[PDB]
Every structure is written in structure tokens, then in C-alpha cells.
Design a protein around this ligand. Structure first.
Ligand code: ATP
Ligand code: ATP
Ligand code: ATP
Ligand code: ATP
Ligand code: ATP
Lengths: 362, 362, 362, 362, 362
DNA sequence: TTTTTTTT
């Protein structure tokens, strides 16, 4: 009798697991009899309780194997290969669809009866977030389209505002929605090339709080970020491929992803501002501050930064046809649930409440 | 007949051996006759005497294997896998339960029939610790709670006071209770960027004495930390995930852990000052150090900076319900032992000798 | 038939051999017929003549094997594994008496009927040696106690003094007496990461003649060595475990060994002086030079370097009660032997020759 | 009927071969019929023609093997193992006694019937070398004795003086006589760690023309060598065992070899000067150049660089009693052979020609 | 049946195949039937068409193997091993004769009826080369004999001249003539250690265009070359075996080859100046320039750089007597071909054209 | 995995 390396490879695929120890550990759990498994009876972790019965017989014989890490390494290679194929063949449209489908799957758990989350608290987050900018959901939808099209030159958005104007909050939320990375170009010009290597194969990137010079008039400390950027023109426009470092390893060539730039109100050289479409800017607004102060479970649960919160806002506001055709079925049922759960006047209470700067969950 | 790899792996799981060499050495000890194993008869180490008879026959065959380290490598992977699994499938509350459970196991054996320390020495330790700062047990319990929740921004406590004021001393014990690491930022900014990654997968972190700049106002050596820290604000508040830098080494996207700052009395820009939940002051105390020299077994045995002394201190003050709900069983069992073995009056005598700074024992 | 890996492993354990090439060479000597072995006949090395007969058969078959280095690798692992086990489970006393026993055993040879060197020379060495300092025997008792008791922060000693003050010599004797290890420091801190690997599982370590800074006014060459060590405060203080590198292997984490450091009389930072129990001066008591120049066998034989000279010094001065109990009869036995070979007059005659800087003997 | 790994190992021992590729290359040559082997018939180099006919049988089957490099590695391991066992257990006198036996064997071939060079040209070279320094052969005898005794901190000789004074020349012949390695320390320290790795198990080292600083006043180009070397006091002193690198090898711990430093006359800091027991001040000597110009065969055959020449000098000059007793039988024959083949009057005539600066011969 | 590893090794041997990928690719070409092989039928490369039909069947079986890279590894190591053997066992003269066989083989193909070299153009090259310095043929012969003798500290020639004086041109031809490699010492001192690695087992080296300092007096850019090279003084002298390394290889110890240094008019330190046996001063010359314009087939076919051009010059100018006895017969045949093909007046007309600054042809 | 590169 023999271990089926195939069945392990299935488990790795179905779970999208790609750490050889994470895989090895979880498969070994299945050696004990599913018949009595506490995690199963407690319906505790889906990547366990969905699977324990299926894999039981193979996991038992795997537990005797003299070869365990070799099997897991071949299984891990299979999952990395799948990512590699997808990265080079898929449309950007499909990638976002995949990313969206995964978030909806995790929301099925969070707000399922087994789940711990409260949909009303998360919806309170959407109201506060929606209030942050006029026509927030149109801003979000425009931004998403822009990333999916990745049209050259028309690729980069600028976020301006004072400290605590929320730009870092929203950037993080978008980055959690789409997937991507942040970068810090305030560095001197030697470190920069290794720094930029981070972007390789990412869907999206973000430039955090760049520093100009002479803004210390406005008490904004000087730095070189702008002067670095104003010499990175060819990366921003995305019109032609560039070579990206990574430490020790060889250079690789691709188009530098689209992205977002964030700053306090330093002066922007006219050369650089031409690189941006659609400069958004942010004020402070005392009532949002007072509201957070009276509904701190938002922050304490990290709701306001979540990609899940943005997805909920899109479902609440956008027409179904705006979603990619595959997920439209899941979109319909989530609209259905949300319509069933919040009658609109509930949401009007929440919005009106935030406008009064009182605690959104009155 | 041939070695059971499974039995070796059970022993590794049961004894939580991380190290291939440590595993190999101990398992080879079992090859001699259990039926007169003198180490067992001397009841020296549980890791041997609790297992030798059970593992004996397999250990005999193990000695003749041509392949020994390969068996041990796979067994060690099994233990490391269990860590990685738990590290992604638990509440912070569960982790503390496990941490405390294990320490209590050590107290059980250490103060057992093997009786290898006098509890009173630790109680003098507890008494010394408790007199350091008002309601010292509450300080532990509330800082502890604070670290369990990891609520954003409500995350950093400042410890301040002169040289040799015990701030370093306290943290070392407390960090040993919980698990985590120290850090330094008295650094030109590059060297900050090579520290950061030691925080990876750390439950908690601590800043060693921060050199502020311009310290020579106190005649303190100036160093870089104060401005660096304000220029690190988000790592404090733990609002949004990041990835962190050792030299070279790996990271996985996570929030920067909560923590503690320790300080000789440099200034703070109220920007950085606003980042904190608490200030707590320190000094040497002169009767107390004249007690230490009169009480030196405390320091010889290091108990003064054992987290065990904190665990014991908590058990003396806090009520059973205030504890991890299953382990509450063990809590009463130890409260029974402690309250039986020690009246409040004997504690008051120690506490009084502590108060005099005379050697705690009389 | 086939090689027994067991018998090779026994030889490695029994010799406590440590290097895989050394073992391979050592064992292959046994392949020749025992009956005529010249090394056996003329009793040159215990490591050979004790064993050739016992291992001849297995050595003959070993000499043919196509796997010889693999066999030796497993054996070397077995010796290393025992070291690792003992490093955790033993008391610092138990370790120290193990060390002393091997010295006693060697002396049973070196003054046995073979007795390959003449105890008078060694005692003359011991004379020059105790004559180096006030209370030298008591000073070493204080040192040894300190190293067993292994207290944090109060953990290391400093030697200071001119070129040829002898400080390095005394360290080398204490290093051998304990069986510690020695570490360079005058290097960049990346390279350090693997030198420190030698400190894994050692009773003790030493650092040497560290290049200070600003020394040039005295011709004293400044260097990175001092400033590098400014960082390493936990390693010195022994406040918590640190992980250490080892090559083609796991890293491992433990408290860093206690130790000492020596210097010629550089500057010292006020922050680091804070972390040594004891600082010791050394001087050109030039008449000692005059003697040794004229007593050269002591130096040629490295007698005044030998840890044996200190073990002899200890056997002379200290009461058997001051020794660890288990060996105490061996102390009597050797004490008697020296009394049966010497008297305080004889020592004091030699002592006075050293005091006179005249050749030790008349 | 497969390859005998034993016979391959035996050949490697006989030849004293370390490089696995050199071993592989030479052993393959034996695959063809020795019966006609031109390298045999022309008796070209002895490491072939002595051994070919014996090994041919096994060399044929070796040539078909699929494991070839693996077999050669094990044989190379055996040679390296032998060097390490000898390094620990022989007296330094024995090492040199064995070394002299090898050179004497080569002199049997050099001046045999194969007779590739005549004894008079080397004896002319001896006269040239003895003319270089006052009491040359006495200096040779002193140096050997110093290296054999290996007295700690009295281990190093400094060769100093202007360019083309001959210090490189003299160092070269000693290095051949004793066997050892050259090292260059002028390179940056971070590279240097692996340079010293070559010194493992070596008898002797020579550091070549390290560069100082400040002698630019005379145009001596400045460099790092002195400062690098001054980090290495320990390695010079031989007081204590130190740790040595190799690529992909863990550190070896041993005492670092003694030997020679050459310099054009930069200044030596006191701390470094203190570590040289002797210094020799070479000087340019016009008539040598005019002799050399008319004695070209010396340089072409590299005669004055051979340890062979120094051995011939010692045999001409020293009492038989100074040689280690085992060799003295051979010394008698070489003394006889020399006195047979040369008058003293010829040697006197030669040294006169040298003294005149003329071509050595008339 | 099974792959014959011996036959692949024979192919590698007979093609001198140093690179494992190049070997693999070419051997796999043979798996198709030679009977139709277009590379054979169009006689495109001799290292294919000579061998295809012989190796065919073993190529077909090799094409199925699962070990293909391992077989190529073994074959390539024997090619490397044979060079390693030859490096030690040949005389420098006999090496040079082997190299001349190899160039003379290539010349049989080049100037063959097959192939395309019109020897008229190459003889024009000899004319232009013979103009560059007085007594050109004597200069080349003197260099060759110097390289054979390899006299210690008389090993290096220095080429000085204005930029554009043919100095790298002449070096290029010598390097091909002798075999050997070019090095760049102007690198930063860190990289330099791996640079010198390529010298291993090479016969000759050239240092291109070393920058001095202060030559900005002529607008020579300054750089490190001269400083670095004087740190390598030991390597030039060639008396003793230096240590060399390549990436991931442990060091090899050998005598560093002789060679040429090229530079513009920088000042050169006395120490480094003393290492050169001969200096040659190149200069711009208008007639060569004006000739070369009207003679550009020389440059377009690189005749002026080729070692083949120098060989033709030697064959023209030097007696049969000066070659070694093995090649002398083949030299006579080439002398016969040249004298038949040309005549003095034809050649003299070329030199006359060049000196007149005409195109070489009229 | 070390090593090389990074890091110095
Ligand atoms: N309208 C607002 N008025 C006042 N405070 C606000 C407002 N919106 C958000 N904040 C506060 O700002 C805090 C910090 O948010 P965030 O880091 O995203 O801002 P930011 O503008 O990007 O800041 P910075 O430039 O300092 O990084 C939030 O946690 C919230 O408490
Ligand atoms: N309150 C106290 N009473 C008695 N002794 C104390 C007290 N505080 C500290 N000391 C002594 O000083 C030692 C050093 O304490 P610690 O390193 O924690 O102080 P620190 O304030 O962090 O010092 P520094 O700022 O100088 O680094 C303690 O371990 C203890 O021996
Ligand atoms: N009292 C003394 N007077 C003179 N010389 C002494 C004295 N004590 C020791 N020495 C000499 O010191 C020499 C070297 O000893 P050692 O290396 O231990 O000294 P050190 O002070 O550590 O020197 P360094 O700092 O140079 O390494 C010995 O050979 C010995 O002869
Ligand atoms: N004392 C001398 N007088 C004259 N010529 C000498 C003398 N010694 C050496 N020579 C000549 O100088 C050449 C180089 O000698 P050598 O390399 O030994 O000198 P060095 O002083 O060590 O030089 P450097 O410091 O430059 O390396 C010898 O080959 C010989 O031709
Ligand atoms: N003496 C000369 N006078 C004028 N042009 C020449 C001369 N020699 C060669 N040239 C032409 O110009 C170039 C100059 O020579 P070369 O290419 O060898 O450059 P270099 O300046 O002498 O060398 P390097 O770049 O190594 O310092 C040649 O390639 C050739 O085309």
C-alpha cells in the first residue's frame, strides 16, 4: 500500500496552501479519526472541517511515511506553479474577479452563522468610510477600472492632505482589496533600486508620504522623495518595460504596476503633476473625528481599514452589471442578504447619525 | 525488525524538542537496560525517566540504524509544523492559556516532591516586586490584558526613570513571561532598518533605553531614538499591516506588535508623546537594594526577574474567575497550596522586612 | 560481513573525538595487524594503544567500505549530541568536576610510572605562577566560584595592563582549566555572527586585547573592536537567550556563556564598565622576566600556560572541603603525593628564587 | 570484480595528493597499457612511471566507472586525514625529520643516473647564498631550531630592508625547506578571513611584503597590511588556539603556525614589533648583481630559491650530531659523496669568483 | 542497452569541451541520423561533422537517459582534470609547442581550399604589424623566450604610450598567440579578489590600461589601478605560490603567470617600476593612420588583432632553427607555402605602401 | 546550504 502524493497535491490546491510546514502540519492533523474529530464537531476551521473525512485514509498512511517533507515539497511546487502560470496568462480583469471571489468566500464564513462577525458593525464602517469623500463609491469604482485597464500615462492617482486626513487609511483599504505593496522613496539614490524590486509581479503599488523640500516652511520636513520621483518618469507612464532589481538575484523585466501617491501639501513640480490623473485631496473633518471617538469598536476591530468594508460598499451602491459577469450571481445573493438585513431607513439612520457626529450605532 | 519512526515522532511531540541534536542525544540514552536504568532510578529528569521504559525496545534498534539523523530530522519537522499550524489558528487568549499552562507544569514539578526550591524565596521575590510600584499586580494584569487585545493605538506604555531604576529589570521578567523581543533605536536611521525584522512573529516587543537626542541637557549621551520614533508613528499604532527588515531575512505581512518603551529622562515631542497609553515612573530604592544584598539567593537564582515571580504574584492577588476558564482548575489547586503554606502574616513579615529593606527573611 | 557503525561510534564516544577527519585518520591506523603495531609496542598515544586490539577486526572491514566518511559523520554527530544534552541538563558544578577529572586523569599519566614529565618542573611552574599575584590561589577560587554561580550583569572580569604584562597568559590557563572558547572581535559585525557560533555550548568564553579608540597618542592602534562590542550588551549581561549561527546547520538559542575580556590600557566607555564584576591590573615585575629568561624550560614546555599548573595550585592551597564532593578523595590522593614529594620549605626556596629573579633552582 | 577503492586510496597516499582533480587526472593515465607507455619509457616523472604498471589493472576498471569523482574524493579525504593526524600527534622534530627524508629522496633522483641537473651548479648556488649574509648557515640552523621549538610569543622573524635586497629570495628557500604557505594580508579585512583558512595543519607561514604608511616620505606607497596584521596579534603569539575558516567548512580550532614577515622598511608599531623575536636587515650588494648577470643558469633553474640548496648548504657546513639521529646515516653518505665529488679548493675557488662578482666558474 | 559514459568522455576530450551546457547541446545534435544531417552535409562546424556519424548510436541511447546532466558533469571534469595534470607536468616550452600545433591546425582550415581566408590580406597585416615597432620580429621572439624561461622577478613587460598608439592592439595578438587572459585591476578593492581568480592555470595574463593618479595633468582620469597593482607586488615577482580563488571554490595555490601591463603616461612608483624587465614606448604615427583609412579590411576582419597574424610574421622572419623539433617540419611546409605564394618584391611593395601611407594595396 | 552579494 502507498501514500497518494496526488491527494496531498489536491489538498494543497483546494486550500491554496504554499508553505511546506503549514501544509505538513495540517495534513498530519487528519491522521486522527474524523469520526470523533473535535475541530470537526466544533466546525472550527473550514480548511479543516471541510476536509478531514475526505483525506482520512491517506493521512493515516502518510503518518507512517519515511519521506514526509519530500511529498509536501512536491505539493508546494504545484501550488507555486499555478500562481506562475496565472501571473503570465490571465487578464487583469480575471485577476480582480479571482481576488473578489476569494473575499466573498471569506465573508461567507465571517457572516455565516458559524462566523463571529457582526454585519451591522461592518455596515457602520461602510457608512463612515462613505462619508470620507463626496461620492466615495464612484471614486472607488473609477479607481478600480483605472487599475484594470492600466492605460499608459493615465495610471497614477495623487492623494493630498494634512496629517490625519485619512489618506493612509484609504490607501491601506484599497491595497487590501486589490493586493499590492507599498514603497518608500524618501531614500537616497543608492538604496532606491533594491527598494523598487518589491513591485515585481504585484498588481498595484503605493507610494507612502513622500517628502519634498522647503515644505518645512509649512513644518513639513524635507526629503528627496520628489526629486527621486521626478527622475522615475519612465516607470510611472508604464508605456515601456523596465528592469527591476532584487537582492542577489538577477534583474527581471516588466511594466511597473499602476499605483497611488500620498503626501502632505508640499509643492509638486509641474513635471510630476502631469504624471497624475485625478488628484484627490483630503481635509480633516472634526465630526468624523468626534464620531470615531464615540464608536471606537470600529477601530478596535480594524473595520475602517478593511478591503471587506470596501467590497460591502460596492455591493450596497453599484448596479450588478458593473461587476464582472461570473460573480454577478454571488453579487445578487449578497445584495439580497443586505437588502433583507438592512432596510434602507436603517442605513439612513446610520448616515444621518454620522452627520450629527454622534455615535453611528445609536 | 526495524526502527519505528512513529515512536520517535511521538516522543518529539510529547517533549516539544525543537533541536535535532538534542532529540538524538536523549533518545540514544534509552538504549541501555530500562530494567536497571540508574538515571531513571535517580529520578533526575522527567524527559528521561517518564519515557525510558516505554521507548526502550525501539531505542535499542535505533542504536543500530545506519540512518539516525534522518529519522530525527523528520521528527523535528513534526514539532515545528505544530507551531506553524497553531501560529495561524488561535486567539491571542488561547496563546496565553498555552503559555501559562506550560509554566504551571514547571511549577508543579519544580516545587514537587523533588522540591527543588523553597517557595518562600519566591514569595520574598513577589513581595519585593509588589512593593516596587502601587498595585503592582494590577499593573501586570492590565498591561497583560492590554497586550492580549492588541487594540490599535491603545498599544504603547512608557516606562521612565533614572539609570538603574529597574525599568530594564522589570521588562526582562515580563517579556520572559509572555514571549517577545527587545529592540534598539539609538541608531542612525539605516541601523533602525536592520533591527526591525526581529519583531517578526513576536507576540510582544520592548524598546531598550531610548537615547533621545540632546540628552546632554541631562548630560545624557544623545542618540537618535526620539525623532526616529515620532517618524515611526504607524508602527506604534498598529493600524495597518507592514513588512519588516532584518538584514536580508524573510517576512510575512503582519501588524507591528504592541509594546513598551523604557527611558532615561530625555524629552518627548508631544507628537510622539501622544502615541502612548501610560507613563510609569521608576527609581532605584535604597532600602530595597540594601535588601538585595541581604537577600542574594533571589538574584543568584534570578527569581527577581523570572516571569514565574510575576505568575506567582498574580496568583496571590487575583481571583480564580479572572483567569483562563479551563485553567481556573489549576488556579484553585495552586491557591490551595499557597494559602495553606502561607498565612497573610508570614507574607506581611516578609513584606515588612522588604519595607525596612532588611533582608526579607527573618 | 559488514562494518558495524556501532563500534566506530563507541570509539568516537570513548575518545570524545570531535572532528570527522581526525576520527577517520585515527580509526584507519587500526587496520594493520595488532600483534606488531609499533605504536602499540612503544606506547606513544593512549588514543591508539588502548584500542587497536579491540577494534582491529572492525577496522579491517572499515578500511574497505565505500561510505567511510558517512560512517564517521554519524559518529561525530553522536559525540556532538551528548555535549548538547549535557549542556542543558547538568549543573555548572557537575560540568566543572567533569572537566577537573580529565585533568587529574592526564596527570596520572604525566607523573605516572610513565610520568612523561617531572613533577618538580611543574611545581616550579606553579611557583612562578602563584608568585605572579597577591592571593593568586584565592583569586582563582573567587574566579571559579564566580563562573559556577553565573550571575547576570555581574558576570565578566576585565584584565588591563601593558604589553607582556602576562594577562593573556593567565587567561589562556583559565581558558584551558575551564575548557572555554576564545573569540576575536576586531571585525565587522556581520562576520561576528558566525564566529560567535563557537560559543554555542561552551562553559566559558574569552575576548582578547580589544582595539580601543583614540589610543594613537600612545601609539595604541584604535579599531572597530571596541565600538563593535558597545552593541553586545545582552550577550555580556546574560539577561536573556540569544540565537547563534552554525554553518550548514540549525542556528540555536540559549543564554550566552560567561567570560572575560583583556586589554592593554585603552579608553573605556562609562556605559560598559557597568557590566563587569572585577577589573584586574597587570605589571612588568621585571625580575620575573629575569627569572624566566633564565628558567626557560618552564616556558619551552608551556608549563606556566598549562591549566595543570592551576589544578596543581588548587591542590596545594585549598582544603578538600572547598572541592566538589564527588572527587574529594582524588584531591586527598594527589595532595598526599605532593606532600610525599615536597615541603613548604622547598616551595618557599623556589618562591624566593623567583622573588630574587634568579634561576628558580639550586 | 569492480573498482578497488582501496588501491586508489593507496596511490593517493603514496603520491601525497590533495587535489581531487590532479588525482583523477593522473590515475586515469594508467588505463592504457604500461607495456608501451611512453611516459614510462621516457621515465618522465616518477609519480607516473613507478606506479603505472602496478595500478593499470585497477586503472582500467576505474576508467569505466560511473562514480569516479566520488572515489577520488574518498581517497583525497584519506590523504587530508593523514595530514591532520600527523599534525596533532608527531613532535615538530619528527615532522621535520620526515620532511628531510623526502627532500633527500628527490636529491637521489636529481643527481641519480636520471641526473637531470649537475651537483656543481647547485654547489655554486650554495656559495652564492652563503655569501649573502654573515654566518649564513648559522642563521639557517637558528631558524630551524626556532621553528621546531615554537616558543610562544618568540616565534617570528622579520626580514627588512630596501627593494631587491634578497629577502624574498631567502624566504622562498626556507619555505620550501620547511614546507608551508605564503599569505598576503594587504587586502581588506572582510576578504581576509578565508585567506587565513589555508594555514590549517601547516608547519610554517610567510607573510609577504605587507605595506605600511607614512614612508611615502621616501616614496614607499602606503597600505593597510600593518593595521590588518595588528588585528591578528593572537595568530602571531601562538598563545592560544584560534578558529580558522574554509569555504563550506565549519571552523577548525588550533594554534596558528610560526614564521616570517618581509617588508620594505615602513615603521612597525610597538605592539607589533614586540611580537618579533628577531629582525634581519638585508642590504643591496653590488657585486652580487654582476655575479648574477654572468651566472644566468642559477636563476633560470631557480637554484637559489630551492630548499634543496639550503639542505646542501647544511650538509656542507654542519656537524652530523646536529641532525635528528634517524637521518644521520643518510647525512654520512651525502658528506662522503660531497667530499668525493668536490675538493674544498674548488669550493674556495668558487666563493672567490662570487666574491669577485665574476661569473662563478673559471 | 545502456549509455557508454566512456564515449561521451571521448567526445569531450577530443573537442576540449570545457562547458557542460555547450557539451550537452552538441552531443544531443547527434541523435538524428547523420545520413541526412544538414550540418554534416553543409560541413558547417568540424566539431560536429567529424564526429556525428561516429557518436550516433550512443547519442540515440543518451537521448533517452534520465541522468544526462550527470554524464556531462563527469565528462567535463576529465577535460578539466587533464588540463590540471598538464599544468604541472609539461615544460613551458612543450606547452608552447602544443599551442603552436593548435594555431597551425586552425590555419590549415582558415587558409584551406575550404574556408575563406585570403592569405594576401593576412600578409598585408604582417606588413602593418612589422611597421609598428622597430625590429618587430625580434621583439616578438624576445617576448616568447622570456615567457618560456619565466625567470623570477624578470617576468613582466610594460607598454606605455599616448592613447591610440596600438598598445592594446599588440597585446591582443600576443595573448591569442600564447593563450592566456586579460584582467581589470581598476576595480574597487573588494571585487578585486574574485577578479584574480581567472588567472588559475593560465599561461599568460595582460593587465589592460591601469589608471594611475594625478595624470589629469594630461587629462588622464585618475583611478585605483596603480595603487591596487602595487598591493599585488608579490604576484608579479613569481617566486612563491600565491593563493587564488573563484566563486564557491576553495583556494588553489600556484605561481602567478607572467604577462604584460599597458598604460598611458601615468607616473609609476619605484617599487612597481622595479618589477618590469622591459618597457616599450608606443606613439601615434600619421602614416599608419592614413594607410589604415585606405586599408580598412584589416580592421573589419580584425586581422590586426589576431594571434594568427603574429604567427605568420614569425614564420616569415625567423629560421626553422628557432622552433622546437616537433613543429620544425610543419614550419618548413608553411615556409614553403608562403614563399611559393608571395615573393620579396611583392611583400616589399606592401611595406613601401604602408610607409608611404597609401592603402596597403596598389 | 554556503556562498555571493550585500553590506561595508
Ligand atoms: N476627517 C477627519 N478629521 C479628523 N481626523 C480624521 C479624519 N479622518 C480620519 N481621521 C483620523 O486620522 C487618523 C489617521 O488616519 P491616516 O493615517 O489614514 O491619515 P493620513 O492623512 O494618511 O495621515 P498621515 O499623513 O499623518 O500619515 C485616523 O485613524 C482617524 O482617527
Ligand atoms: N527600585 C529599585 N530598588 C532597588 N534596586 C533597584 C531598583 N531599581 C533598580 N535597582 C537596581 O538597579 C539594577 C538595574 O536596573 P535596570 O537596568 O532595570 O535600570 P534602568 O533604569 O533600566 O537603568 P539604565 O537606565 O541605567 O540602563 C536593578 O537590577 C537593581 O539591581
Ligand atoms: N612581571 C613580568 N615582568 C616582565 N615580563 C613579564 C612579566 N609577566 C609576564 N611577562 C612576560 O609577558 C610575556 C607575554 O605574556 P602575555 O602575552 O600573557 O602578556 P600580555 O600582557 O597579555 O601581553 P600582550 O598585551 O602583548 O598580549 C611572557 O613571555 C612573559 O615573559
Ligand atoms: N643583496 C642583493 N644584492 C644585489 N642584488 C640582489 C640582492 N638580493 C637579491 N638580488 C637581486 O634581486 C632580485 C630580487 O631579490 P628579492 O626578491 O629576494 O629581493 P627583496 O629585497 O625581497 O625585494 P622586494 O622587497 O622588492 O620584494 C634577485 O633575484 C637578485 O637578482
Ligand atoms: N600608432 C598609431 N597611430 C595612430 N592610430 C593608431 C596607431 N596604432 C593603432 N591605431 C589605430 O587606433 C587605435 C589605437 O590603438 P589601440 O586600439 O590599441 O588603442 P590604445 O590607445 O593604444 O590602447 P588602450 O585603449 O588600451 O590604451 C587602433 O585600434 C588602430 O585602429
Amino acid at each position: 500500500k502507498q501514500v497518494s502524493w496526488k491527494l496531498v497535491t489536491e489538498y494543497a490546491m483546494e486550500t491554496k496552501c504554499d508553505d511546506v510546514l503549514l501544509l505538513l502540519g495540517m495534513y498530519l492533523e487528519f491522521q486522527y479519526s474524523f469520526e470523533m474529530c473535535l475541530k470537526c464537531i466544533k466546525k472550527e476551521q473550514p480548511s479543516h472541517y471541510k476536509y478531514h473525512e475526505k483525506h482520512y485514509a491517506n493521512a493515516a498512511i502518510f503518518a507512517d511515511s519515511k519521506n514526509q517533507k519530500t511529498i509536501c515539497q512536491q505539493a508546494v511546487d504545484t501550488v507555486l506553479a499555478k500562481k506562475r502560470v496565472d501571473s503570465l496568462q490571465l487578464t487583469r480583469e480575471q485577476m480582480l474577479t479571482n481576488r473578489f471571489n476569494d473575499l466573498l468566500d471569506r465573508m461567507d464564513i465571517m457572516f455565516g452563522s458559524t462566523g463571529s462577525a457582526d454585519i451591522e458593525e461592518w455596515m457602520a464602517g461602510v457608512a463612515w468610510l462613505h462619508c470620507l469623500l463626496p461620492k466615495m463609491d464612484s471614486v472607488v469604482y473609477d479607481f478600480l477600472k483605472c487599475m484594470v485597464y492600466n492605460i499608459p500615462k493615465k495610471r497614477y492617482w495623487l492623494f493630498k492632505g494634512p496629517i490625519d486626513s485619512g489618506k493612509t487609511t484609504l490607501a491601506a483599504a484599497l491595497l487590501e482589496l486589490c493586493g499590492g505593496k507599498a514603497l518608500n522613496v524618501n531614500l537616497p539614490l543608492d538604496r532606491l533600486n533594491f527598494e523598487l524590486g518589491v513591485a515585481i509581479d504585484q498588481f498595484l503599488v503605493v507610494f507612502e508620504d513622500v517628502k519634498g523640500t522647503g515644505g518645512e516652511s509649512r513644518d513639513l520636513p524635507s526629503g528627496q522623495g520628489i526629486n527621486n520621483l521626478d527622475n522615475l518618469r519612465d516607470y510611472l507612464d508604464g508605456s515601456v518595460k523596465v528592469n527591476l532589481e532584487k537582492k542577489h538575484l538577477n534583474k527581471r523585466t516588466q511594466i511597473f504596476p499602476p499605483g497611488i501617491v500620498t503626501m502632505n501639501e508640499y509643492s509638486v513640480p509641474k513635471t510630476l503633476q502631469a504624471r497624475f490623473v485625478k488628484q484627490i485631496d483630503f481635509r480633516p473633518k472634526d465630526y468624523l473625528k468626534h464620531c470615531l471617538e464615540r464608536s471606537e469598536f470600529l477601530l478596535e476591530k480594524r473595520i475602517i481599514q478593511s478591503g471587506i468594508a470596501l467590497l460591502l460598499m460596492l455591493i450596497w451602491y453599484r448596479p450588478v452589471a458593473e461587476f464582472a459577469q461570473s460573480i454577478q450571481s454571488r453579487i445578487v445573493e449578497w445584495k439580497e442578504r443586505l437588502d433583507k438585513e438592512f432596510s434602507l431607513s436603517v442605513y439612513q439612520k446610520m448616515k444621518f447619525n454620522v452627520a450629527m457626529g454622534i455615535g453611528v450605532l445609536d
